[PDB]
Design an enzyme around this catalytic site. Structure first.
Site, mmCIF file in Angstrom:
data_model
loop_
_atom_site.group_PDB
_atom_site.id
_atom_site.type_symbol
_atom_site.label_atom_id
_atom_site.label_comp_id
_atom_site.label_asym_id
_atom_site.label_seq_id
_atom_site.Cartn_x
_atom_site.Cartn_y
_atom_site.Cartn_z
ATOM 1 C CG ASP B 31 -1.453 1.236 1.520
ATOM 2 O OD1 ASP B 31 -2.175 1.766 2.643
ATOM 3 O OD2 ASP B 31 -1.536 1.619 0.586
ATOM 4 C CG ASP B 215 -3.743 3.877 -1.743
ATOM 5 O OD1 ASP B 215 -4.813 4.133 -0.947
ATOM 6 O OD2 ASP B 215 -3.104 3.336 -1.523
#
Lengths: 423, 329
Positions: B31, B215
């Site tokens: 992430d 993201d």
């Protein structure tokens, strides 16, 4: 259907009494007006926000996952042998969530995890924790017994009356009882003398069956003499299926290849949805109640080993994702189901969550003014199925099978059970 | 070094890492939106069903483990996890690094029971790391083994390789044309300036500019509630509790959505953002674009997750504080 996005974006953390003794059961209590109940539940379902619908779905899934968690007994669930083998994930969750009200740190912090917490992933303390979950779980009942597009009598009924039988001189607190009111309207706290278990058990049955109007599979079974509280939820499911009829001639069934049983039936003619998984050898048909609610009948393709197949009917995300929606002409044929079923949550849950120990632990308070030592925390169900008068598939359930009623609107399965033989 | 990723329903992309001696294996999402590393802990009460359903790190079975014990809570957009810090050797794509990570003891059923992965490996900057724990990529760079201070993401279509991360560079095998870079607004966050968002024929969004957080941990492309309301109204989509739907029969008819980044238009077709499950007008089909209000200082901001990365191979350049995009192959 069907996916779930994950939002992994890190951020800088953010967020956000008058007691009373209940009367004895000898007091003349009027019975539950079941019509009046469901008509109130449909109003609760009607007057409900779009945000609340998501909450009802959310608390539904928590109840689902708790039910699948509880299969961590590993085929010992039916080992809790009282009545017909069928448990109510939504009732289990609720009865467990209602004990959470009467819980301080540690005990509440355990049930938080055990019940399935924390709904929000935090305990900023508010009207949601205990109060939100309970009234959300009220909603899921109204969502089941809906008939939104139907309007007319949907014919499905779901009654849930919570008995909270305390000992003599146990001044149980007010705000806790208002919490229970959010979960169910029929909250019946009434005192009882637990020193005599034989006399209590027989009277506790005489009270409820008088108040409710349906035979529950015994009560106060396996309760200790030195006890006070007895938090017993009582549920009753009515499930009328249009296009079905009860047969005067019994088709009979085989609980195993050798033995036979004289038993009733319900013939069904209609084009339902059904799709058979050939990977693990599976097959499941349904008979919807306004789509919203759906009775799923899990048939084991071979029907030789259920314990293995039935294991895949409590298997996490798979049972719900079983939703191809492939229609087909099916001749439905199944036994007429009218059975009770009791199970104590403290016997139902153990080891992995070990609440039995946590229950007889001191920390409750918010319910308990005086000393609480629970004898049983029972869930009793009365599941009932009924009928209202070129090529096909003759789907008979001659050998044992599995089933589960599920609500799409509240994404929650209210019941799951096994059928060995009607008796 | 490359990490092989598994694609689960187009919403969860995860690879494997090994922690401890002997190695204890974990499925983790990489992430760029967060900076901490965490996996479920053996010390997590089994009352948390999510812990019953995931691999648990057991420190008492690792001889390379180093105790710390500092408490930490990690707050994501869709959920929170809490536990304590621990140190041990972590194996990632062939590289071995000593790393401080979180052992989670509180992991809510919702949403973690729905997680295929066990934990998360933050690929963000130390400025966003909770408890000021050195991020795993900074630790790898400190070894001075990588040929470049950059990492790249390739997210495949659902199919059924699921995807691939390259530590130290990019894989020419999964992209074509050349990269077009956009400088980071600031170090510490993989966020970039977005000049505008257009739907069909009408740049009715992000006029006057806005922010875009690249993201890899986000399943979808997200915008603030106000922005998404407009975008969706323009699409004819209906809002639900957790997403937006459209009657399936109209999924293929939905207009293109374009994202103006660094002087280049990145365009998605309806096939790129709608989960075309069927074509019936009696069914609903979800869209891979959601509404997500990301709190300051990072937000408000749009989030370009898997939906976007599937279309564009993405390179995160630490040496030049920039992000590069190129047509995925």
């Amino acid at each position: 259907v069907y996916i779930h996005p994950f939002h992994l974006v890190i951020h800088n953390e953010s967020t956000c009494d008058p007691t009373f003794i209940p009367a004895p059961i000898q007091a003349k209590t009027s019975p539950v007006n079941e019509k009046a109940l469901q008509d109130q539940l449909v109003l609760v379902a009607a007057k409900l926000d779009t945000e609340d619908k998501l909450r009802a779905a959310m608390v539904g899934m928590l109840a689902n996952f708790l039910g699948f968690r509880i299969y961590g007994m590993h085929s010992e669930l039916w080992g809790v042998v009282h009545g017909a083998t069928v448990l109510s994930p939504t009732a289990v969750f609720g009865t467990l969530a209602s004990l959470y009200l009467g819980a301080l740190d540690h005990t509440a912090d355990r049930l938080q995890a055990i019940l399935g917490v924390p709904w929000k992933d935090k305990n900023c303390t508010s009207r949601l924790d205990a109060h939100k979950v309970l009234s959300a779980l009220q909603a899921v009942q109204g969502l089941l017994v809906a008939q939104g597009r139907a309007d007319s009598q949907a014919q499905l009924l779901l009654s849930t009356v919570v008995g909270v039988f305390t000992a003599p001189g146990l001044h149980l607190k007010q705000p806790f009882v208002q919490g229970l009111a959010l979960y169910t309207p029929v909250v019946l706290p009434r005192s009882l003398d637990f020193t005599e278990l034989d006399v209590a058990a027989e009277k506790i049955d005489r009270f409820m069956q008088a108040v409710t109007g349906w035979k529950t599979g015994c009560s106060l079974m396996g309760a200790s003499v030195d006890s006070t509280l007895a938090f017993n939820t009582y549920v009753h499911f009515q499930g009328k299926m249009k296009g079905f009829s009860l047969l005067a001639e019994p088709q009979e069934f085989w609980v195993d290849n050798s033995t036979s049983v004289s038993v009733p039936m319900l013939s069904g003619m209609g084009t339902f949805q059904h799709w058979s998984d050939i990977q693990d050898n599976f097959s499941v048909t349904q008979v919807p109640f306004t789509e919203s609610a759906c009775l799923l009948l899990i048939q084991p393709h071979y029907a030789s080993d259920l314990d293995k197949v039935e294991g895949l009917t409590f298997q996490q995300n798979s049972l719900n994702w079983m939703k191809k929606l492939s229609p087909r002409t099916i001749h439905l044929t199944m036994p007429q189901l009218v059975l009770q079923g009791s199970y104590d949550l403290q016997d139902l849950l153990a080891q992995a969550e070990l609440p039995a120990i946590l229950h007889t632990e001191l920390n409750l308070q918010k319910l308990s003014n005086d000393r609480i030592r629970v004898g049983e925390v029972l869930n009793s169900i009365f599941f009932e199925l009924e009928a209202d008068e070129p090529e096909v598939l003759e789907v008979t359930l001659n050998r044992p099978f599995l089933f589960a009623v599920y609500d799409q609107s509240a994404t929650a399965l209210h019941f799951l059970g096994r059928v060995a033989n009607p008796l | 070094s490359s990490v092989i990723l598994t694609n689960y329903m187009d919403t969860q992309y995860y690879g494997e890492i090994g922690i401890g001696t002997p190695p204890q294996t974990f499925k983790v999402v990489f992430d760029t939106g967060s900076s901490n590393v965490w996996v479920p802990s053996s010390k997590c009460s089994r009352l948390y069903t999510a812990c019953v359903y995931h691999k648990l790190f057991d420190a008492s079975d690792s001889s390379s483990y180093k105790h710390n014990g500092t408490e930490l809570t990690l707050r994501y957009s869709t959920g929170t996890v809490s536990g304590f810090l621990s140190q041990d050797i972590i194996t990632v794509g062939g590289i071995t690094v000593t790393q401080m990570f979180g052992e989670v003891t509180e992991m809510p059923a919702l949403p973690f029971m729905l997680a295929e992965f066990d934990g998360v490996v933050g690929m963000g900057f130390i400025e966003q790391a909770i408890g000021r724990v050195t991020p795993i990529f900074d630790n790898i760079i400190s070894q001075g083994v990588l040929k470049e201070d950059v990492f790249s993401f390739y997210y495949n279509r659902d199919s059924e390789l699921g995807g691939q991360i390259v530590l130290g560079g990019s894989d020419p095998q999964h992209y074509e044309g050349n990269f077009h870079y956009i400088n980071l607004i600031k170090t510490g966050v993989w966020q970039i300036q977005m000049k505008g968002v257009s739907v069909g024929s009408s740049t009715l969004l992000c006029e006057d500019g806005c922010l875009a957080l690249v993201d890899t941990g986000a399943s979808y492309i997200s915008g603030s509630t106000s922005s998404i309301e407009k975008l969706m109204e323009a699409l004819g989509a209906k809002k639900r509790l957790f997403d937006y739907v459209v009657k399936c029969n109209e999924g293929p008819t939905l207009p293109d959505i374009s994202f103006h980044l660094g002087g280049k238009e990145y365009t998605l077709t309806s096939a790129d953002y709608v989960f075309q499950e069927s074509y019936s007008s009696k069914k609903l089909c979800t869209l891979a674009i959601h509404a997500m209000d990301i709190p300051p200082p990072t937000g408000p901001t749009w989030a370009l997750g898997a939906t976007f990365i599937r279309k564009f191979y993405t390179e995160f350049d630490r040496r030049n504080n920039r992000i590069g995009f190129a047509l995925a192959r």
